[PDB]
Amino acid sequence: SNRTILVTGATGTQGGATVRALLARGRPVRALVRDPGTDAARALAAAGVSLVTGDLNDQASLRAAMADVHGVFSVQTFMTPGGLGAELRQGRAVADAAAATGVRHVVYSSVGGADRASGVPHFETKWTIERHLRSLGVPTTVLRPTFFMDNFAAWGPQAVDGTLVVRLPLKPQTRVQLIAAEDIGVFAATAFDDPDTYVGAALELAGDELTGPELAARFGELAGMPARFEERSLDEAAADPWIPYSHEIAVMFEWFQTDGYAADIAALRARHPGLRTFADWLRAIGWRVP
Amino acid sequence: SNRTILVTGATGTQGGATVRALLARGRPVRALVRDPGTDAARALAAAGVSLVTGDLNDQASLRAAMADVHGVFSVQTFMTPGGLGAELRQGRAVADAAAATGVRHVVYSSVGGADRASGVPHFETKWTIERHLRSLGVPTTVLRPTFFMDNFAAWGPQAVDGTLVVRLPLKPQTRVQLIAAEDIGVFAATAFDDPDTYVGAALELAGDELTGPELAARFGELAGMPARFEERSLDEAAADPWIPYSHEIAVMFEWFQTDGYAADIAALRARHPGLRTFADWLRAIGWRVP
């Protein structure tokens, strides 16, 4: 009264996962979408999500969408034509709308290390959004995901004559923390239902921590194929015409090499005993070789 | 012995200005360019600049270009297809090359407020580059330009039936500090010839500080036309399809509204009595209505 959560990015990977986790806890869910006729929008409706049609970049539409809601899940991506500037404006606009409409709890998806002066441009934008939320005093839980399993499956492994080759700008011993989008959903929904524990918290999220060689072995094990890891230079990775936002990704990998994530996996698994390992996750999403 | 300065971005506005200022003080100047056959490259050669042909994004080429040089002028732009990630990598690579080749003095072009946690994505990249330079211990002067006169002439004013209209996302009373690229050159060259005063310094640079209405009046006065200023919203400016990097520019203008530059114009004019006002500058570059 009212218990509804507005989920931004509801048709994307994190927002979609958050919708599922919320429905699994019996929260009512609302999403603001530009076109409710898409397959993704229609799938939300079939799941019981209330769709409001509108553009969230219209301030008034965003406020209208927050009418009577308890909470908002706020997530943006830099991977649009408006890039980091567009991301920043949208993140701050969601925050402003929440403050204006009396939203009781925002869960904001940031990034692990956002608070550690990484210098990674897309981390720094999320930090700026965190600071803005804090300045407004809206009750907030910040989730700071580590490396998404979901995106490092789409460009990591390549089949080369029957061997799976993971070629990334990591040293063979560089450990990388990873998180399933499904678990971001779990923690968002958990946060809304336990504000005493979660309001004012910022939690770095990982379900696994693996090297390049270990990642390759997991793909190969599932696929029934030999696998190997090969280091590539940061310069080579940065300049790759086939990797979207290659230069930005290379800056991020250099930060994995120099600094890296700091989630407390054990603490997270204590709270969420089903926290996915990479092996868990691969099997559950039926990963296939491209 | 040796007195040569390597100027990065030598064919661009700041690097070009820096070349002129250095030649005016009798420094030898070197530039690394991908194609020495361009009009811009050939103009540098005619001015007495030694061209080395190569790509600066090749580490070895960049080190080679710094052989025996005294100093390096380091400048990058986010306005390329590789965006802020590409800028960051290049800025850090110039710094690394300078450290490796024993360069005695780097002058780095940052941005006013880079040090004040602006949250503006392209300011934050320059701050990250500053921090990297500082970490390497290479003797450095940081120049932090304010709003370039040279770019706010290319998109500010528009002729509408014989009236010049400056339409920007500023409140009519918002004061903006501005700087001529020519003066960045002057301060870079001055820094190399006075290391005692300039090494370890970071100087915010402006030659004028004006409101929107004042900017319009200056364009109109030169052009012999009536002029006026009109505020537009940040949202409208951000979403403009005809402004490249519109969203990023709107984030920057919002920072002009909330925070703004802090150069000490009087102190700068004491050092450089020819520091250009906007009126000075317009007249000198023969600005024309588009």
XYZ file of C-alpha atoms in Angstrom:
580
model
C 0.000 0.000 0.000
C 1.450 0.668 -2.341
C 4.032 -2.080 -2.860
C 4.715 -1.483 -6.584
C 8.248 -1.250 -7.935
C 8.991 0.685 -11.128
C 11.768 -1.139 -12.982
C 13.820 0.909 -15.448
C 15.534 -0.999 -18.263
C 12.904 -3.665 -17.813
C 13.497 -5.077 -21.299
C 17.305 -5.296 -20.748
C 19.325 -7.957 -18.930
C 19.500 -6.465 -15.426
C 16.055 -4.934 -15.447
C 14.594 -8.198 -16.771
C 16.246 -10.174 -14.008
C 14.984 -7.680 -11.468
C 11.439 -8.016 -12.775
C 11.641 -11.816 -12.329
C 13.044 -11.585 -8.806
C 10.372 -9.065 -7.780
C 7.523 -11.171 -9.166
C 8.991 -14.172 -7.352
C 8.588 -12.287 -4.067
C 5.046 -11.167 -4.960
C 5.820 -7.520 -5.577
C 3.686 -5.757 -8.128
C 5.885 -4.475 -10.960
C 5.496 -1.534 -13.333
C 7.606 -0.619 -16.364
C 7.676 2.496 -18.558
C 8.335 1.523 -22.161
C 8.314 3.488 -25.421
C 6.553 0.702 -27.336
C 4.414 -1.901 -25.588
C 4.116 -3.890 -28.824
C 7.656 -5.291 -28.856
C 8.249 -8.976 -28.094
C 10.116 -7.941 -24.934
C 7.359 -5.590 -23.754
C 4.662 -8.136 -24.530
C 6.621 -10.758 -22.535
C 6.645 -8.413 -19.534
C 2.878 -7.972 -19.846
C 2.343 -11.731 -20.015
C 4.349 -12.063 -16.804
C 1.970 -9.651 -15.053
C 4.008 -6.418 -15.335
C 1.906 -3.257 -15.676
C 3.221 -1.318 -18.697
C 2.993 2.444 -18.959
C 3.754 3.717 -22.396
C 6.045 6.702 -22.478
C 9.666 7.803 -22.803
C 11.562 7.957 -19.537
C 13.735 10.794 -20.861
C 10.609 12.939 -20.605
C 10.831 14.171 -16.984
C 7.046 14.462 -16.636
C 6.557 10.952 -18.011
C 9.068 9.575 -15.516
C 7.368 11.314 -12.600
C 4.012 10.094 -13.827
C 5.376 6.535 -13.999
C 6.437 6.807 -10.324
C 2.965 7.771 -9.103
C 2.205 5.752 -5.978
C 5.145 3.390 -6.354
C 7.081 2.226 -3.330
C 10.416 1.732 -5.056
C 12.426 2.237 -8.249
C 15.140 0.051 -9.765
C 17.451 2.422 -11.590
C 19.838 1.151 -14.288
C 21.358 2.795 -17.380
C 23.983 1.802 -19.957
C 26.719 3.847 -21.641
C 26.268 1.722 -24.762
C 23.906 3.992 -26.660
C 24.603 6.692 -29.268
C 24.486 9.399 -26.569
C 27.175 7.532 -24.595
C 28.326 8.544 -21.127
C 26.760 11.986 -21.276
C 23.340 10.470 -22.020
C 23.809 7.854 -19.307
C 24.694 10.472 -16.707
C 21.715 12.686 -17.549
C 19.318 9.757 -17.388
C 20.679 8.412 -14.121
C 20.419 11.846 -12.525
C 16.910 12.337 -13.961
C 15.668 9.050 -12.473
C 17.107 10.167 -9.128
C 15.482 13.610 -9.401
C 12.104 12.042 -10.313
C 12.266 9.697 -7.348
C 13.030 12.635 -5.010
C 10.173 14.677 -6.458
C 7.503 11.941 -6.278
C 8.213 10.694 -2.748
C 9.639 7.299 -3.762
C 10.511 5.418 -0.562
C 13.445 3.332 -1.815
C 15.694 3.488 -4.869
C 17.915 0.511 -5.769
C 20.619 1.808 -8.108
C 22.867 -0.438 -10.217
C 26.371 1.034 -10.217
C 29.642 -0.907 -10.727
C 32.240 -2.489 -8.482
C 35.045 -0.027 -7.807
C 32.977 3.034 -8.687
C 33.975 4.338 -5.279
C 37.697 3.614 -5.717
C 38.643 6.314 -8.241
C 39.199 3.785 -11.020
C 39.503 6.331 -13.794
C 37.485 4.024 -16.014
C 35.129 6.475 -17.817
C 32.010 4.344 -17.529
C 32.705 3.612 -13.855
C 33.134 7.288 -13.144
C 29.736 8.115 -14.593
C 28.093 5.659 -12.210
C 29.996 7.181 -9.297
C 28.683 10.620 -10.281
C 25.145 9.200 -10.268
C 25.715 7.648 -6.834
C 26.882 11.014 -5.489
C 23.802 12.729 -6.952
C 21.453 10.212 -5.329
C 23.217 10.707 -2.012
C 22.920 14.501 -2.336
C 19.140 14.226 -2.767
C 18.706 12.120 0.391
C 16.428 9.579 -1.273
C 16.704 6.263 0.616
C 18.980 4.180 -1.581
C 20.618 0.803 -1.926
C 23.531 0.737 -4.351
C 24.440 -2.543 -5.963
C 27.893 -2.571 -7.539
C 28.132 -5.515 -9.907
C 31.459 -6.928 -10.993
C 32.106 -8.394 -14.474
C 28.826 -9.561 -15.924
C 28.772 -13.216 -16.896
C 26.085 -12.326 -19.433
C 28.329 -10.093 -21.544
C 31.472 -12.087 -21.136
C 29.855 -14.924 -22.851
C 28.943 -12.963 -25.955
C 32.512 -11.945 -26.839
C 34.937 -14.081 -24.749
C 35.129 -17.567 -26.380
C 35.679 -18.397 -30.068
C 35.779 -21.880 -31.713
C 38.947 -22.440 -33.688
C 38.967 -25.823 -35.458
C 37.243 -27.569 -32.559
C 39.084 -25.826 -29.704
C 37.466 -23.020 -27.691
C 39.851 -20.084 -27.391
C 39.349 -17.337 -24.856
C 41.438 -14.438 -25.925
C 41.316 -11.423 -23.577
C 43.624 -8.691 -22.335
C 44.334 -10.466 -19.040
C 47.542 -11.947 -17.732
C 47.047 -15.728 -17.225
C 47.120 -15.279 -13.470
C 44.834 -12.134 -13.349
C 41.728 -13.089 -11.282
C 38.452 -11.446 -12.350
C 35.292 -11.344 -10.243
C 32.089 -12.146 -12.122
C 28.366 -11.846 -11.392
C 25.197 -13.251 -13.012
C 22.551 -10.686 -13.920
C 20.029 -13.021 -12.290
C 21.770 -12.383 -8.952
C 21.597 -8.643 -9.368
C 17.833 -9.190 -9.584
C 17.858 -11.312 -6.449
C 19.756 -8.677 -4.452
C 17.558 -5.819 -5.755
C 14.369 -7.634 -4.696
C 15.932 -8.686 -1.395
C 16.849 -5.054 -0.708
C 13.274 -3.771 -1.195
C 11.904 -6.417 1.217
C 14.593 -5.771 3.859
C 15.147 -2.023 4.031
C 16.594 -2.215 7.547
C 19.571 -4.195 6.248
C 19.773 -2.621 2.771
C 18.916 1.076 2.878
C 22.156 3.049 2.988
C 24.144 0.021 1.885
C 26.407 -0.236 -1.154
C 27.257 -3.842 -1.953
C 29.848 -5.062 -4.433
C 28.448 -8.195 -6.101
C 30.262 -11.307 -7.387
C 29.382 -15.002 -7.470
C 32.784 -16.249 -8.764
C 36.391 -15.217 -9.203
C 38.361 -16.896 -11.995
C 41.397 -16.503 -14.230
C 41.352 -16.614 -18.039
C 42.503 -20.249 -18.054
C 39.761 -21.165 -15.620
C 37.124 -19.387 -17.698
C 38.214 -21.310 -20.800
C 38.043 -24.627 -18.888
C 34.482 -23.908 -17.845
C 33.326 -23.173 -21.408
C 35.114 -26.296 -22.669
C 33.668 -28.526 -19.980
C 30.106 -27.517 -20.842
C 30.674 -27.698 -24.594
C 32.521 -31.015 -24.552
C 35.467 -29.372 -26.345
C 39.108 -28.686 -25.580
C 39.687 -25.085 -24.526
C 42.573 -22.707 -23.909
C 43.256 -19.163 -22.843
C 45.537 -16.765 -24.741
C 46.597 -13.337 -23.420
C 46.409 -10.428 -25.810
C 47.999 -7.046 -25.308
C 45.949 -4.093 -24.089
C 46.923 -2.166 -27.215
C 45.667 -4.963 -29.481
C 42.407 -5.279 -27.605
C 41.874 -1.512 -27.620
C 42.316 -1.191 -31.351
C 40.044 -4.113 -32.338
C 37.474 -2.953 -34.919
C 35.121 -5.843 -34.037
C 34.829 -5.094 -30.322
C 32.263 -2.370 -29.752
C 33.601 0.303 -27.380
C 36.931 -1.503 -27.659
C 38.998 1.317 -26.164
C 36.730 1.645 -23.160
C 36.791 -2.131 -22.634
C 40.583 -2.092 -22.771
C 40.702 0.649 -20.130
C 38.473 -1.587 -17.975
C 40.692 -4.651 -18.487
C 43.752 -2.645 -17.598
C 42.006 -1.777 -14.350
C 41.344 -5.542 -13.807
C 45.103 -6.038 -14.181
C 46.154 -3.109 -11.929
C 43.399 -3.008 -9.361
C 40.288 -5.152 -9.713
C 37.056 -5.898 -7.916
C 36.679 -6.451 -4.179
C 33.329 -8.192 -3.563
C 33.140 -10.474 -0.557
C 31.801 -13.650 -2.210
C 31.507 -15.598 1.031
C 29.419 -12.840 2.645
C 27.166 -12.686 -0.375
C 26.642 -16.480 -0.484
C 25.717 -16.370 3.243
C 22.852 -14.080 2.335
C 21.968 -15.745 -0.956
C 22.886 -19.420 -0.863
C 21.993 -19.857 -4.566
C 24.502 -17.170 -5.703
C 25.651 -18.463 -9.108
C 29.109 -19.690 -9.917
C 30.204 -19.327 -13.528
C 29.809 -23.078 -13.996
C 26.276 -22.903 -12.391
C 25.314 -20.065 -14.636
C 26.613 -21.445 -17.952
C 24.598 -24.583 -17.434
C 21.446 -22.698 -16.451
C 21.474 -20.338 -19.454
C 22.340 -23.110 -21.961
C 25.389 -21.345 -23.395
C 26.225 -22.278 -26.984
C 29.318 -21.866 -29.169
C 29.088 -19.154 -31.911
C 70.994 21.062 -26.374
C 68.573 19.795 -27.125
C 65.859 22.461 -27.029
C 63.299 20.707 -29.280
C 59.657 20.406 -28.274
C 57.485 17.590 -29.631
C 53.970 18.959 -30.128
C 51.131 16.425 -30.170
C 47.954 17.432 -32.013
C 50.091 19.794 -34.034
C 47.522 19.987 -36.838
C 44.656 20.787 -34.389
C 43.707 24.108 -32.797
C 45.660 23.928 -29.527
C 48.658 22.122 -30.926
C 48.784 24.563 -33.854
C 48.735 27.527 -31.513
C 51.450 25.929 -29.429
C 53.621 25.417 -32.497
C 53.293 29.140 -33.341
C 54.106 30.276 -29.809
C 57.151 27.986 -29.646
C 58.514 29.176 -32.994
C 57.982 32.754 -31.825
C 60.333 32.070 -28.908
C 62.886 30.341 -31.163
C 62.296 26.807 -29.961
C 62.838 24.062 -32.480
C 59.593 22.134 -32.980
C 58.917 18.537 -33.997
C 55.596 16.875 -34.823
C 54.658 13.225 -35.390
C 52.018 12.976 -38.098
C 50.444 10.028 -39.918
C 50.542 11.788 -43.297
C 52.997 14.586 -44.038
C 51.242 15.309 -47.342
C 48.148 16.985 -45.886
C 47.685 20.750 -46.235
C 48.000 21.060 -42.448
C 51.182 18.971 -42.273
C 52.710 20.796 -45.223
C 51.913 24.135 -43.516
C 53.803 22.971 -40.422
C 56.791 22.049 -42.591
C 56.737 25.445 -44.297
C 56.819 27.064 -40.859
C 60.011 25.154 -40.021
C 58.517 22.257 -38.006
C 60.404 18.963 -38.351
C 57.855 16.264 -39.259
C 58.302 12.636 -38.302
C 55.909 10.356 -40.061
C 54.290 7.785 -37.839
C 51.235 7.035 -35.708
C 51.491 8.207 -32.124
C 49.267 5.338 -30.962
C 52.221 3.088 -31.765
C 54.171 3.196 -28.469
C 57.523 2.638 -30.197
C 56.791 5.395 -32.710
C 55.948 7.800 -29.894
C 59.151 6.988 -28.024
C 61.115 7.349 -31.228
C 59.512 10.761 -31.818
C 60.696 11.873 -28.344
C 64.343 11.017 -29.007
C 66.482 13.887 -27.739
C 63.593 16.280 -27.206
C 63.540 18.605 -24.232
C 59.777 18.836 -23.870
C 56.404 17.490 -25.015
C 53.089 19.305 -25.412
C 50.424 16.717 -24.714
C 46.824 17.239 -25.879
C 44.035 14.813 -26.829
C 40.335 15.143 -27.676
C 37.361 12.951 -26.747
C 35.782 13.824 -30.093
C 36.927 10.804 -32.068
C 35.198 7.467 -32.746
C 37.078 5.847 -29.835
C 35.747 8.551 -27.484
C 36.821 8.911 -23.866
C 38.401 5.478 -23.672
C 40.653 6.274 -26.645
C 41.486 9.693 -25.215
C 42.472 8.229 -21.856
C 44.706 5.556 -23.388
C 46.462 8.089 -25.589
C 46.999 10.604 -22.811
C 48.464 7.914 -20.571
C 50.623 6.590 -23.435
C 52.120 10.034 -24.111
C 52.899 10.286 -20.392
C 54.460 6.802 -20.323
C 56.579 7.594 -23.419
C 57.834 10.813 -21.874
C 58.809 8.948 -18.673
C 60.589 6.241 -20.657
C 62.602 8.572 -22.929
C 63.833 11.016 -20.277
C 61.730 13.995 -21.417
C 62.577 16.935 -19.143
C 59.236 18.770 -19.185
C 55.707 17.824 -20.211
C 53.055 20.536 -20.682
C 49.666 18.817 -20.524
C 46.402 20.436 -21.650
C 43.664 19.437 -19.212
C 40.471 21.425 -18.452
C 39.395 23.946 -15.849
C 37.714 22.177 -12.946
C 39.265 18.797 -13.715
C 40.463 18.848 -10.127
C 37.067 19.773 -8.649
C 35.180 16.493 -9.124
C 32.913 17.967 -11.793
C 31.401 14.676 -12.866
C 31.595 15.857 -16.456
C 32.808 12.701 -18.293
C 35.316 14.455 -20.526
C 36.694 16.466 -17.597
C 37.126 13.322 -15.566
C 39.222 11.691 -18.265
C 41.634 14.621 -18.199
C 41.835 14.397 -14.413
C 42.744 10.709 -14.713
C 45.523 11.660 -17.144
C 46.784 14.342 -14.747
C 46.924 11.782 -11.932
C 48.844 9.352 -14.162
C 51.413 12.004 -15.085
C 51.842 12.861 -11.418
C 52.314 9.176 -10.536
C 55.170 8.881 -13.046
C 57.049 11.878 -11.604
C 57.740 13.440 -14.994
C 58.201 17.211 -14.536
C 54.883 18.651 -15.659
C 52.976 21.863 -16.167
C 49.221 21.409 -16.422
C 47.228 24.020 -18.264
C 43.500 23.879 -17.564
C 41.678 25.847 -20.235
C 38.177 27.152 -19.703
C 35.562 27.405 -22.492
C 37.346 27.648 -25.806
C 36.461 30.725 -27.822
C 37.375 28.741 -30.932
C 34.593 26.176 -30.535
C 32.007 28.514 -29.168
C 32.092 30.406 -32.333
C 31.339 27.419 -34.528
C 28.010 26.549 -32.880
C 26.933 29.516 -30.679
C 25.499 32.235 -33.001
C 22.917 31.813 -35.785
C 21.552 34.515 -38.168
C 17.782 34.704 -38.109
C 16.425 37.263 -40.597
C 19.266 39.698 -39.941
C 19.510 39.239 -36.158
C 22.259 37.132 -34.566
C 20.769 34.747 -32.017
C 22.879 32.993 -29.431
C 20.872 30.144 -28.101
C 22.593 28.116 -25.355
C 21.665 26.235 -22.203
C 22.710 29.092 -19.911
C 20.624 31.264 -17.648
C 20.908 34.916 -18.825
C 22.972 35.785 -15.776
C 25.265 32.643 -15.876
C 28.872 33.908 -16.346
C 31.165 31.658 -18.409
C 34.952 31.943 -18.519
C 36.474 31.708 -21.992
C 39.987 31.279 -23.394
C 41.559 31.699 -26.856
C 43.518 28.710 -28.135
C 46.254 31.177 -29.086
C 46.729 31.906 -25.368
C 47.042 28.253 -24.505
C 49.974 28.287 -26.936
C 51.460 31.340 -25.262
C 51.277 29.763 -21.796
C 52.679 26.414 -23.027
C 55.707 28.129 -24.604
C 56.127 30.404 -21.588
C 56.137 27.344 -19.321
C 58.960 25.597 -21.230
C 61.142 28.744 -21.055
C 60.450 29.329 -17.340
C 60.488 25.947 -15.626
C 61.215 27.480 -12.217
C 57.826 29.205 -12.234
C 55.905 26.572 -14.230
C 57.068 23.064 -13.362
C 54.663 21.605 -10.814
C 52.086 24.270 -11.586
C 48.508 23.716 -12.734
C 46.978 26.903 -14.100
C 43.335 27.474 -14.970
C 43.234 29.681 -18.081
C 40.691 32.343 -19.117
C 40.977 35.672 -20.926
C 37.317 36.760 -20.454
C 34.204 36.033 -18.442
C 30.852 36.860 -20.048
C 27.150 36.056 -19.935
C 25.070 34.856 -22.894
C 23.721 38.369 -23.508
C 27.235 39.761 -23.486
C 28.456 37.109 -25.918
C 25.634 37.965 -28.329
C 26.478 41.696 -28.101
C 30.073 40.999 -29.031
C 29.138 38.974 -32.128
C 26.629 41.652 -33.165
C 29.071 44.497 -32.680
C 31.646 42.880 -34.960
C 29.083 41.829 -37.560
C 27.225 45.140 -37.638
C 23.976 43.310 -36.813
C 21.462 43.320 -33.985
C 21.953 40.378 -31.635
C 20.163 38.676 -28.760
C 20.568 35.803 -26.364
C 17.890 33.160 -25.728
C 18.112 30.522 -22.969
C 17.257 26.971 -23.898
C 16.583 24.153 -21.485
C 19.267 21.591 -20.685
C 16.940 18.830 -21.866
C 16.426 20.535 -25.237
C 20.123 21.121 -25.720
C 20.959 17.540 -24.742
C 18.565 16.016 -27.224
C 19.585 18.165 -30.228
C 20.406 15.927 -33.216
C 22.528 18.674 -34.831
C 24.903 19.210 -31.912
C 27.631 16.586 -31.969
C 28.122 15.042 -28.515
C 25.023 16.990 -27.501
C 24.444 15.087 -24.261
C 28.013 15.562 -23.118
C 27.849 19.274 -23.972
C 24.644 19.598 -21.966
C 26.299 17.951 -18.957
C 29.093 20.535 -19.314
C 26.649 23.459 -19.521
C 24.826 22.217 -16.470
C 28.157 22.326 -14.669
C 28.601 25.957 -15.906
C 25.235 26.695 -14.281
C 25.925 24.840 -10.989
C 29.633 25.326 -10.525
C 31.779 26.876 -13.244
C 35.363 27.839 -13.918
C 37.682 29.588 -11.474
C 40.604 31.066 -13.452
C 42.178 34.203 -12.048
C 42.031 36.462 -15.128
C 43.856 39.355 -13.491
C 46.770 37.105 -12.477
C 46.979 35.690 -15.966
C 46.946 39.141 -17.632
C 49.782 40.210 -15.272
C 51.892 37.454 -16.766
C 50.626 37.794 -20.325
C 49.525 41.356 -20.999
C 48.169 40.405 -24.458
C 45.755 37.777 -23.019
C 42.785 37.947 -25.414
C 39.347 39.187 -24.535
C 36.486 37.734 -26.552
C 36.152 41.036 -28.405
C 39.978 41.041 -29.079
C 39.835 37.522 -30.350
C 36.781 37.819 -32.623
C 38.397 40.711 -34.413
C 41.747 38.948 -34.765
C 40.316 35.723 -36.229
C 37.918 37.551 -38.602
C 34.794 35.740 -37.405
C 32.019 35.476 -39.989
C 28.300 34.679 -39.800
C 27.264 31.186 -41.088
